[PDB]
Amino acid sequence: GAMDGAEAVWTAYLNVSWRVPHTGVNRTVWELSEEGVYGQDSPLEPVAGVLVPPDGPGALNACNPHTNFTVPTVWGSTVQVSWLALIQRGGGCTFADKIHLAYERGASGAVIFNFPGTRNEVIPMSHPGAVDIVAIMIGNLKGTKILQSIQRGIQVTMVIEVGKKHGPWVN
């Protein structure tokens, strides 16, 4: 019938910032919200970084274990800035596959977004084989909005923080 609240699910607070060009030197649009949920096997801790999707048409699912990301570097070196992999759900591979790849590429967290037609729906992720970095899910609409901004050359930064506990049913 309804198998919700079997285990605690923790929401995430997201503070998302867009680097808007051409309207004045410091201008950023930012949205603070409680959307997204930490994966069930995620470290429960904050993380922040520049959002980076997989390269190329159409590798958005990061199923291919040789999937590449184009990651910004620190001025004057080859060292990566702190970054979060932005990866679409689906494509025939697991949450653990996507989250593990993110970690192996040096990402500080993995932001999985739900697939087309699910709107703003988020679900809990099970990924006990991939626990090294923060992993959250966000909705399709928010993920798409972010991905399109990035594809249009806008840098998008996200700070993720531990949100609120939902469940389990104790009475």
Ligand X SMILES: *[C@@H]1O[C@H](CO)[C@@H](O)[C@H](O)[C@H]1NC(C)=O
CB 151 within 8 A of CB 57: no
Quick one: tokens of 138? 């966000």
Taking the C-alpha atoms of residue 161 and residue 171, their distance in angstroms, rounded to an integer, is 29
Q: Show Cβ contacts of residue 156 under 8 Å, excluding neighbours closer than 6 positions.
A: 16, 17, 18, 19, 50, 51, 146, 149, 150
Cα gap 48→75, rounded to integer Å: 19
Q: Which stretch binds its own copies (CB under 8 A): 64-72, 74-82, 87-95, 146-154?
A: 87-95
Total residues interacting with its own copies, rule: CB under 8 A: 32
Site of interaction with ligand X (CB under 6 A): 56, 64, 66-68
Q: Which does 78 bind (CB under 5 to 8 A by kind): its own copies, ligand X, none?
A: none
User: Is residue 117 close enough to count as binding its own copies by CB under 8 A?
Assistant: no
- Residue 67: contacted member of its own copies, ligand X, none (CB under 5 to 8 Å, by partner type): ligand X
- Does the protein bind its own copies through residue 44 (CB under 8 A)? no
Question: How far is the CA of 148 from the CAs of 18, 40, 142, 145, in angstroms?
Answer: 12, 28, 10, 5
Looking at beta carbons only, is 64 or 118 nearer to ligand X? 64
> Does 127 interact with its own copies (rule: CB under 8 A)?
yes
Residue nearest to ligand X (CB): 68
Q: Contact residues for its own copies (CB under 8 A)? A: 1-9, 37, 40, 89-90, 92-96, 120-127, 166-171
